[PDB]
């Protein structure tokens, strides 16, 4: 998934547009992955935490960032499951920050209107 | 005769005293009982449950299926069943979940009088409007998956 | 308190059978239903509305006790009630054995055990 | 087969009660080599006692289907933890009972195995 995020959005034929990337994540990422953020050293960057915890999301400087990406398991038992915890992840996102655009991958339609209720 | 339940900041002022002294029923009748129901019997539809007026009731949403531990649903509604309180003054319970944990739990409860069951996820706001949710006493959301969950996200997203 | 009345021959009772089975009424089962309730009562409408606005809750309680021995263990307040800005926040905390001295604000609501019924 | 009223009503009095622990699943003790030592030819038929099997149905059934050849056998539903069952089938007045669990060798936790028993 991260691999095909920095293929489409590093896209070389596009425009500079000048933005910083940021990682957010409990798990620790692989060492291709690293190797192709310092290709990209500039603009790409990672580190470790838990989404849900604002002290990690001030470190992130969520406050400041244009916006917040939100990819999903589409592989994942119980959709449900993920699109419930991708609606948390929103919640407490714009809980810490209500002032930030919020773009999330979704595998069903009823969460759709969930996310509305925010 | 009992000792005086005290309450105060600190056991000083408790120890003053001292220092400054100077069918309708169940077998026993403890609690409300009624015949032994069938579940079929009292699950509603949703066009009979709006039908069915509500006022000052008790909504129970439970969130759970086949696989799931279970929540002992009968000693939440033995307090409400208490005989101190009068058949009208006895809140409507309506179990609002899916019929699996609830037909799991049905033979604890088919003793009790005035409950309810509508299968459907509470999530759905039209099974909530169906019970008149706005009239209601108390909405309970409990979760029967509390413990299969173990990661800190999946942890109470249904109920949040 | 929460269980509703822990009589041992309540519990002796579940313990043999089980489980709970129905029985006939008796004056021995109109004995086990006089227990004390609990219940929340409106300090804006009531008889003692006029005690609304009475900052000392020991008056409160005091004619209370007096009137009909109903025990106010605490007191549930608005959230802005202590502010003066009139807002529509319906949110209530507890206050937990008001002092005497506590001052009172006619928009409350009232922990109270009624009397053996 | 006896309910707790039909057991109540009936008298047992110096017989044998076996509290059977065991389900569909639990594999099959082989009650006939306990009733066939007891139903001797050399006791005299008012000698013999009455066996009265406690437990579950199905697992009594499926011995049943063997133990049908042997006077004085009673069956009864119900679990043996409770004071109902031992009561309605006269747990004083007998003249022994039998702890048994058919659930022994399916279980690996040595604080697990003798529970029900114990």
Not at chain 1, 40 to 67: C, M
Not at chain 2, 4 to 28: L, Q
Not at chain 2, 100 to 108: D, P, S, V
Not at chain 3, 25 to 41: E, F, G, I, K, W
Request: charged share 20%; glycine share 4%; net charge neutral.
């Amino acid at each position: 998934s991260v691999s095909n995020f920095l293929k489409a959005f590093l896209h070389k034929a596009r425009d500079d547009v000048n933005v910083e990337i940021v990682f957010l994540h409990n798990i620790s990422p692989n060492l291709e992955l690293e190797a192709l953020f310092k290709r990209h050293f500039t603009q790409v960057e990672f580190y470790q935490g838990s989404v849900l915890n604002p002290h990690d999301l001030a470190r992130v400087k969520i406050e400041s960032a244009d916006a917040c990406l939100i990819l999903a398991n589409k592989y994942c038992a119980d959709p449900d499951a993920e699109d419930a915890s991708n609606i948390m992840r929103v919640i407490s996102i714009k809980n810490y920050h209500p002032k930030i655009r919020i773009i999330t991958q979704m595998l069903q339609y009823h969460n759709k209107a969930h996310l509305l209720n925010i | 005769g009992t000792l005086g339940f005290f309450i105060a900041s600190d056991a000083k002022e408790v120890k003053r005293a001292f220092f400054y002294c100077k069918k309708k029923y169940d077998s026993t009748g403890m609690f409300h009982w009624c015949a032994p129901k069938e579940i079929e019997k009292v699950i509603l539809t949703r066009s009979e449950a709006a039908m069915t007026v509500l006022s000052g009731h008790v909504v129970v949403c439970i969130f759970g299926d086949v696989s799931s531990a279970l929540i002992g649903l009968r000693n939440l509604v033995m307090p409400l069943r208490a005989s101190n309180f009068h058949y009208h003054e006895l809140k409507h319970i309506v179990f609002v979940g899916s019929i699996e944990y609830l037909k799991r739990e049905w033979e604890t409860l088919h003793n009790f009088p005035k409950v309810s069951i509508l299968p459907g996820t509470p999530l759905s706001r039209a099974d909530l409007r169906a019970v008149n949710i706005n009239l209601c006493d108390m909405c309970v959301i409990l979760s029967a998956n509390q413990n299969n969950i173990d990661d800190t996200s999946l942890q109470d997203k249904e109920c949040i | 308190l929460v269980t509703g009345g822990a009589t041992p021959e309540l519990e002796a009772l579940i313990a043999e059978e089980n489980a709970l089975r129905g029985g006939y009424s008796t004056p021995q089962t109109l004995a086990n239903r006089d227990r004390c309730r609990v219940a929340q009562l409106a300090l804006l409408d009531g008889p003692f509305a006029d005690l609304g606005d009475g900052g000392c809750y020991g008056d409160l309680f005091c004619k209370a006790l007096k009137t009909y021995n109903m025990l106010c263990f605490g007191i549930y307040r608005l959230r802005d009630a202590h502010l003066s800005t009139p807002s529509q926040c319906t949110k209530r905390y507890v206050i937990t054995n008001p002092p005497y001295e506590f001052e009172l604000v006619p928009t409350d609501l009232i922990f109270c055990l009624m009397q053996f019924d």
